[PDB]
Amino acid sequence: VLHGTMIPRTKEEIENIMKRLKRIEGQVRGVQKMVEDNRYCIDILVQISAIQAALRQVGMQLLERHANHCVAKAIREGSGEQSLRELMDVIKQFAK
Amino acid sequence: VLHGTMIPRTKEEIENIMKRLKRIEGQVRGVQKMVEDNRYCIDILVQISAIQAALRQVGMQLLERHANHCVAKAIREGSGEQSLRELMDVIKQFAK
Amino acid sequence: VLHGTMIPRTKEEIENIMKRLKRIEGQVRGVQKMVEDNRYCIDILVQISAIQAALRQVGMQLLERHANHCVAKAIREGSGEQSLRELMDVIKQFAK
Amino acid sequence: VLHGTMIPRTKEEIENIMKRLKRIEGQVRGVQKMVEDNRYCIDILVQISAIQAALRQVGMQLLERHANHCVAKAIREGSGEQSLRELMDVIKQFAK
Ligand SMILES: [Cu+]
Ligand SMILES: [Cu+]
Ligand SMILES: [Cu+]
Ligand SMILES: [Cu+]
Ligand code: NA
Ligand code: NA
Ligand code: NA
Ligand code: NA
Ligand code: NA
Numbered sequence: 076v077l078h079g080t081m082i083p084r085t086k087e088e089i090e091n092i093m094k095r096l097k098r099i100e101g102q103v104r105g106v107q108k109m110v111e112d113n114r115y116c117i118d119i120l121v122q123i124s125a126i127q128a129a130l131r132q133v134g135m136q137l138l139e140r141h142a143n144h145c146v147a148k149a150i151r152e153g154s155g156e157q158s159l160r161e162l163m164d165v166i167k168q169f170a171k
Numbered sequence: 172v173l174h175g176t177m178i179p180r181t182k183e184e185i186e187n188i189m190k191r192l193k194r195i196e197g198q199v200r201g202v203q204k205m206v207e208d209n210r211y212c213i214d215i216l217v218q219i220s221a222i223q224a225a226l227r228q229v230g231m232q233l234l235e236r237h238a239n240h241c242v243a244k245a246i247r248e249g250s251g252e253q254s255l256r257e258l259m260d261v262i263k264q265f266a267k
Numbered sequence: 268v269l270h271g272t273m274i275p276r277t278k279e280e281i282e283n284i285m286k287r288l289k290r291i292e293g294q295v296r297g298v299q300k301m302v303e304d305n306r307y308c309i310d311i312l313v314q315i316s317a318i319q320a321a322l323r324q325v326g327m328q329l330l331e332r333h334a335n336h337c338v339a340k341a342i343r344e345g346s347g348e349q350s351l352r353e354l355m356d357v358i359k360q361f362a363k
Numbered sequence: 364v365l366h367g368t369m370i371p372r373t374k375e376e377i378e379n380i381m382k383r384l385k386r387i388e389g390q391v392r393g394v395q396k397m398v399e400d401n402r403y404c405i406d407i408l409v410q411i412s413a414i415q416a417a418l419r420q421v422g423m424q425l426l427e428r429h430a431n432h433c434v435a436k437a438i439r440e441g442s443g444e445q446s447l448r449e450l451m452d453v454i455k456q457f458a459k
């Protein structure tokens with residue numbers, strides 16, 4: 076452990092995220108097949124754009140979830156500044 | 172076909188890109204395992220940030236390759252405006 | 268008022284940010300003069316890229332400042348969740 | 364000069380872009396007044412988000428204009444690869 080407060084994921088949450096990552100995994104191998112089949116660079120870039128888009132989506136979702144629940148809990152419990160600093164670090168990371 | 176001029180990829184080009192997509196595929200399943208193991212949301216977000224970063228890298232590489240070779244060839248061959256319009260569309264796509 | 272906790276800016280903080288916005292204001296009018304003088308589109312785009320860069324910089328700075336001080340204070344004072352929700356909204360805004 | 368082919372801007376084009384940069388200039392000074400009046404950091408960030416948004420808009424517009432007309436002309440005239448390389452440089456610049 077050795078980290079900020081966390082609300083554990085449900086069977087539901089894990090399942091949903093998982094599909095999104097599977098779909099994304101598929102897209103990634105789809106792109107793999109495209110490169111192997113020597114498909115047009117533009118077609119490939121379109122799919123890459125799709126992937127990046129799907130990643131921002133799942134990433135934002137996890138960000139909001141963590142802030143709305145886990146960080147919110149820490150604020151209630153008294154470890155908010157700890158959790159807030161973590162949160163700011165990943166924000167700057169997504170900016171770097 | 173029915174698309175702009177393309178310079179076909181070498182055994183070399185395909186191999187290199189492929190590793191990058193494999194590594195990225197790994198990262199994606201790594202993230203999958205992380206979610207399943209109910210790992211900390213922040214740790215997961217860091218890895219997602221890594222993935223998006225690796226995707227921008229391979230995407231930019233493919234973009235430059237296509238422009239430097241394929242689009243450049245079309246300009247020489249006389250189908251440059253065709254290839255240029257395609258290129259502008261994917262740029263706007265990466266912006267949307 | 269009617270908003271989350273705020274630590275007021277110093278004479279110092281206001282001065283520093285101000286220079287950065289002035290410089291940015293200059294860049295913006297520089298770009299204005301460039302357009303008027305019918306300068307090359309590429310040169311103009313380079314300067315626009317500069318401006319956007321300078322804006323991300325000052326924006327991130329204000330973001331960190333607000334989180335490190337104002338939001339941190341609210342967490343101590345007991346209005347952290349209020350301040351956290353605000354913070355998440357502007358994050359999503361910078362993403363939209 | 365010493366640059367790729369350029370189609371000069373009309374009285375119209377200059378006028379339109381100009382308004383957009385003026386509005387943006389206003390926003391920038393609006394933000395200046397906000398900082399001076401010691402307004403809430405969140406309110407300021409919202410306006411900064413607005414500005415960055417308006418800059419992407421005018422920037423993309425100039426990008427498309429340059430590609431659709433100036434770079435397209437160079438391709439017809441025989442200096443397309445020259446103009447294409449310039450265009451790729453500013454793309455990478457907006458990515459750096
Ligand atoms: Cu969390
Ligand atoms: Cu290509
Ligand atoms: Cu603040
Ligand atoms: Cu131009
Ligand atoms: Na905590
Ligand atoms: Na403290
Ligand atoms: Na072509
Ligand atoms: Na034409
Ligand atoms: Na507050």
Ligand code: NA
Pocket residue numbers: 348
């Ligand atoms: Na609460």
Ligand code: NA
Pocket residue numbers: 366367368437442443445446
């Ligand atoms: Na030219």
Ligand code: NA
Pocket residue numbers: 444
């Ligand atoms: Na050539």
